[PDB]
């Protein structure tokens, strides 16, 4: 990706302004629940202003930084895709479950992940990638050994390095692994995305067996799903107490969110920060709460 200068950033801001104006169309009636594009693009704008202010008089330093070059290219691309969604979608955008509205929700989730990453790498607007603290010690040691203090690596280099410790099946498993870890959908793995993935699928010692058991062969796992989409999806099981699904929390990145149908026909969502996901699912099954993953009668045996 090319060098970033102030003129590229301001062009991106103009495109972002066009998106937030399109999204305020009263016929659209977007709900305010996270991930909310009308929160996320303004917050992204404000954080980018903070970054540019920290680099006043040294914009060349910022604009040559590899992570920032990739980030700005991706933000521009994804903002243009959102505009194209409105121009191709026209009145279909006003229908809640239309293809363009589902695409807008997926993009909203991607913008949320991008913002979180940007703040993890530039917490007060200054680049802090070289001292980024990976949460799990065994995962931190992997990154230090393979990549030093690097903040971002291409997917193919990341795959090759990870395969040395946790072998990866070629084909669709490798594709599914990439889709899980590449939260910002940019074909790179940042140290932030690595931190999130290794928190979600801890312990490191069995990382990809955990991921396979919780995300590939578990029908309860939902990729790129929001809180409101979980409520919608479980509505058809409101008559089947114990139906449940789980996904990444979008506002507490690195935490899981489990949605379930209660005995009195409510849909609740909970974040099991007290214990690992494996254990939350095991305990919830034994206690009668997490019985029917995505409404199915058979539940995986995580023992």
């Amino acid at each position: 990706p090319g060098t970033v200068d102030k003129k590229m950033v301001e062009k991106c801001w103009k495109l972002m302004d066009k998106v937030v104006r399109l999204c305020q169309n009263p016929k659209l009636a977007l709900k305010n629940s996270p991930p909310y594009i009308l929160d996320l693009l303004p917050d992204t704008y404000q954080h980018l202003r903070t970054i540019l202010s920290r680099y006043e008089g040294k914009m060349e330093t910022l604009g040559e930084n590899e992570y920032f070059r990739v980030f700005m290219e991706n933000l521009m691309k994804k903002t243009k895709q959102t505009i194209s969604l409105f121009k191709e979608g026209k009145e279909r955008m006003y229908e809640e479950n239309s293809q363009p509205r589902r695409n807008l929700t997926k993009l909203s989730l991607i913008f949320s992940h991008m913002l979180a990453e940007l703040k993890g790498i530039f917490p007060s607007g200054l680049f802090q990638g070289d001292t980024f603290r990976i949460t799990k010690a065994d995962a931190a040691e992997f990154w230090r050994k393979a990549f030093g203090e690097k903040t971002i690596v291409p997917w193919k280099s990341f795959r090759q390095a990870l395969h040395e410790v946790h072998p990866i099946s070629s084909g669709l498993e490798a594709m599914a692994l990439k889709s899980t870890i590449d939260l910002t959908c940019n074909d790179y793995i940042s140290v932030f995305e690595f931190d999130i993935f290794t928190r979600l699928f801890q312990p490191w010692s069995s990382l990809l067996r955990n991921w396979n058991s919780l995300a590939v062969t578990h029908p309860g796992y939902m990729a790129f799903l929001t809180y409101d989409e979980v409520k919608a999806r479980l509505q058809k099981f409101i008559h089947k107490p114990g139906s449940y699904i789980f996904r990444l929390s979008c506002t507490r990145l690195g935490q899981w969110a489990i949605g379930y149908v209660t005995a009195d026909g409510n849909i609740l969502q909970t974040i099991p920060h007290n214990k690992p996901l494996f254990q939350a699912l095991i305990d919830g099954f034994r206690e009668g709460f997490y019985l029917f993953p995505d409404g199915r009668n058979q539940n995986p045996d995580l023992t």
């Binding site: 937030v20 996270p34 909310y36 909970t270 007290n274 919830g284």
Partner: peptide, 24 residues
């Protein structure tokens, strides 16, 4: 009623929050 469209630089994120409840 007016529907005032706010610009990118005028929106202070509402930061509205989804309801997460204690484990069952």
């Amino acid at each position: 009623q007016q529907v005032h469209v706010l610009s990118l630089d005028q929106i202070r994120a509402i930061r509205n929050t989804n309801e997460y409840t204690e484990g069952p």
